[PDB]
Amino acid sequence: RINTVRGPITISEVGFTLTHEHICGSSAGFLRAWPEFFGSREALVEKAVRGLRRARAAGVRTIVDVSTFDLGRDVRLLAEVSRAADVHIVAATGVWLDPPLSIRMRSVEELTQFFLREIQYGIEDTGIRAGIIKVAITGKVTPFQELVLRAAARASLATGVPVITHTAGSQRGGEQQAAIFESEGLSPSRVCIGHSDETDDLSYLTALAARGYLIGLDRIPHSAIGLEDNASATAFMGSRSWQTRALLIKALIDQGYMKQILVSNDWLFGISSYVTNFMDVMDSVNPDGMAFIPLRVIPFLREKGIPQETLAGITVTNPARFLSPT
Amino acid sequence: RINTVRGPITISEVGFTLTHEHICGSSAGFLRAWPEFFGSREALVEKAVRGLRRARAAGVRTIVDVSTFDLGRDVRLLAEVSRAADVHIVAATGVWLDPPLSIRMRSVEELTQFFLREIQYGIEDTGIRAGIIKVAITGKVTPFQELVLRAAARASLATGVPVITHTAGSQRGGEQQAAIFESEGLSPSRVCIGHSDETDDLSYLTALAARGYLIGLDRIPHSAIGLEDNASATAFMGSRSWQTRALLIKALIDQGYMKQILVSNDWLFGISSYVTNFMDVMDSVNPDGMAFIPLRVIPFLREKGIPQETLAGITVTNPARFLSPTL
Numbered sequence: 001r002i003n004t005v006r007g008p009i010t011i012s013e014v015g016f017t018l019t020h021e022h023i024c025g026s027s028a029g030f031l032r033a034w035p036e037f038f039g040s041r042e043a044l045v046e047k048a049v050r051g052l053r054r055a056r057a058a059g060v061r062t063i064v065d066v067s068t069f070d071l072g073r074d075v076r077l078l079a080e081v082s083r084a085a086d087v088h089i090v091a092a093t094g095v096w097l098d099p100p101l102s103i104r105m106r107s108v109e110e111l112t113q114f115f116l117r118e119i120q121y122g123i124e125d126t127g128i129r130a131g132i133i134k135v136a137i138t139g140k141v142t143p144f145q146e147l148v149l150r151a152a153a154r155a156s157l158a159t160g161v162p163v164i165t166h167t168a169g170s171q172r173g174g175e176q177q178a179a180i181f182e183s184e185g186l187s188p189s190r191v192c193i194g195h196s197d198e199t200d201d202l203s204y205l206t207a208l209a210a211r212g213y214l215i216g217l218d219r220i221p222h223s224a225i226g227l228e229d230n231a232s233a234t235a236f237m238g239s240r241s242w243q244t245r246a247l248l249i250k251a252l253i254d255q256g257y258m259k260q261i262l263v264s265n266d267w268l269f270g271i272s273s274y275v276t277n278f279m280d281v282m283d284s285v286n287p288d289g290m291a292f293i294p295l296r297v298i299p300f301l302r303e304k305g306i307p308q309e310t311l312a313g314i315t316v317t318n319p320a321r322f323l324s325p326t
Numbered sequence: 327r328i329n330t331v332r333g334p335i336t337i338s339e340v341g342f343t344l345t346h347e348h349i350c351g352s353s354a355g356f357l358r359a360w361p362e363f364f365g366s367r368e369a370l371v372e373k374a375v376r377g378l379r380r381a382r383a384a385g386v387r388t389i390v391d392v393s394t395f396d397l398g399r400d401v402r403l404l405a406e407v408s409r410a411a412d413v414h415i416v417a418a419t420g421v422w423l424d425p426p427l428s429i430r431m432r433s434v435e436e437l438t439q440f441f442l443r444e445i446q447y448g449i450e451d452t453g454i455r456a457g458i459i460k461v462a463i464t465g466k467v468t469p470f471q472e473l474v475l476r477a478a479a480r481a482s483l484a485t486g487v488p489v490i491t492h493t494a495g496s497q498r499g500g501e502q503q504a505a506i507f508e509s510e511g512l513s514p515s516r517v518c519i520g521h522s523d524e525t526d527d528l529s530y531l532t533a534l535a536a537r538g539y540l541i542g543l544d545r546i547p548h549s550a551i552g553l554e555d556n557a558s559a560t561a562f563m564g565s566r567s568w569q570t571r572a573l574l575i576k577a578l579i580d581q582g583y584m585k586q587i588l589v590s591n592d593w594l595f596g597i598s599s600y601v602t603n604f605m606d607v608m609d610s611v612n613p614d615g616m617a618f619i620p621l622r623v624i625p626f627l628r629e630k631g632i633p634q635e636t637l638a639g640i641t642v643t644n645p646a647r648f649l650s651p652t653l
């Protein structure tokens with residue numbers, strides 16, 4: 001069974017899953033301290049519900065919010081929006097790239113306990129339990145990031161809950177992360193190497209896939225083509241077309257690794273951790289939001305000749321095998 | 327009228343005030359996400375209530391908790407402890423040394439609006455309003471720190487609430503902050519240069535006091551060495567005696583600046599922003615806690631010939647004048 005913000009669900013209920021999304025990209029405590037940054041908490045809720053409903057209609061039944069403590073994860077916000085939109089939402093524990101001092105001063109043993117509290121007992125005082133662990137690195141894994149990766153591994157081994165990662169920028173850190181995970185004894189089938197669509201290095205992708213890693217092709221709609229004049233847009237969404245990103249799905253299918261692919265939008269409905277009004281920039285690029293995958297991508301892959309059954313297998317079977325604890 | 331976590335109080339109700347303290351030194355959202363780091367929320371409350379009742383029995387009537395959003399300020403915690411201990415607590419807005427991305431990506435205009443929200447409307451959804459603005463800088467003022475200093479000057483000018491600031495990683499350094507504040511039109515009488523007891527340079531402090539700045543001699547008990555083993559307790563506390571620090575109070579009095587002096591402990595009852603069990607190290611060197619000032623420093627200055635009325639001016643009159651919103 002899989003933990004959601006509304007409680008436990010069966011594999012069968014999971015359905016069509018977007019495994020890499022956010023309701024809001026922020027910082028710990030920020031939404032509670034300055035809700036007016038988003039207009040109001042009430043507007044943010046309405047926008048998230050009006051978006052999750054358009055995706056639900058397009059077939060989406062589950063999303064995984066990979067927002068950690070330090071990404072401003074507000075679990076009560078997740079519950080409100082999930083219940084209102086009637087779409088499953090899996091919450092995360094772990095540590096992203098903006099840990100405050102109270103997190104970054106902690107040991108591997110302490111960080112392990114923290115992830116365990118959030119998976120086994122609940123997030124804050126809510127009883128809502130994390131379904132996944134999200135970690136991140138920059139360039140070469142820093143000493144602190146190594147502690148986080150090791151703690152994430154130990155937590156996964158204790159609870160069966162999977163791990164999702166990424167490396168800042170377009171850097172290909174999967175091999176370095178994979179090395180640390182395996183030194184802890186973690187099975188690659190419990191790990192997704194995320195943001196893998198930031199690169200066109202197919203040898204890199206296939207090799208990880210061949211080892212059993214899930215390949216997170218999850219920023220498909222991100223593209224600053226047309227926004228060349230907006231330097232902050234480029235740094236965030238890149239210069240590669242969404243088509244180029246989506247073709248990596250085909251390419252990996254064509255190598256026989258369909259069972260290892262996870263597809264998503266890495267979207268959200270508010271963001272405060274970047275430049276002001278960046279949400280409006282993203283919205284002007286991908287008006288379909290979280291519906292971009294079921295609506296505009298699936299047909300694309302359908303057109304290029306991928307069998308419907310293979311897609312269903314990627315959008316339903318894969319997420320379920322991934323999310324289901326072991 | 328001065329805002330506290332229990333509502334507005336009149337100037338006469340403030341009494342003996344510790345102008346630079348914390349209930350807990352943490353990170354935003356952390357106490358709510360990992361209360362077990364402190365044993366439990368319930369354990370932290372009990373420890374803080376006992377600590378504040380001790381201070382109160384030593385004469386303390388108000389403290390100023392200078393904890394910002396990014397220092398993990400929890401105003402519901404402050405309200406609970408204030409009520410239980412019957413000690414007034416003034417809450418803070420501002421930015422300390424650990425802003426998350428959602429803060430450090432903001433413009434001067436945005437930070438001003440944030441501080442104003444916390445002073446004029448309330449903190450989070452509690453209706454509790456900040457009565458002071460806390461800012462911090464390092465070495466040479468960073469571009470972002472300059473933004474914070476200016477936003478703080480602007481919020482002060484709009485509300486009359488005072489500003490407390492300090493320089494981490496160096497003694498001196500108040501001149502930078504003074505230049506920036508004054509460039510914005512802020513009266514020095516609205517500004518306390520905190521952690522000033524960390525310097526021995528008396529000419530530097532007197533010069534600031536003569537410009538009208540308030541001098542925060544507010545880490546007196548952090549002198550503590552004893553523990554040569556820890557490169558974390560002599561790099562976070564020091565190597566001088568608390569007496570040498572307290573003598574700076576006498577020294578500024580003797581120069582005729584008694585009205586410009588604020589005195590405090592910079593204590594707390596939990597801390598998560600440094601090494602695990604740093605609280606135990608702190609408690610071992612100063613078991614008096616926030617009572618350190620009234621139990622050790624006051625008697626010490628008394629024995630040095632400082633009269634009652636001067637001591638009361640420093641601990642009662644100065645803080646009331648400082649905190650009373652003045653435009």
Ligand SMILES: [Zn+2]
Binds near residue numbers: 166
């Ligand atoms: Zn990421």
Ligand SMILES: [Zn+2]
Binds near residue numbers: 020166194195218266
């Ligand atoms: Zn992502």
Ligand SMILES: [Zn+2]
Binds near residue numbers: 020021022066266
């Ligand atoms: Zn993401």
Ligand SMILES: [Zn+2]
Binds near residue numbers: 462492521
């Ligand atoms: Zn300080």
Ligand SMILES: [Zn+2]
Binds near residue numbers: 492592
């Ligand atoms: Zn201080």
Ligand SMILES: [Zn+2]
Binds near residue numbers: 346347392
């Ligand atoms: Zn302090």
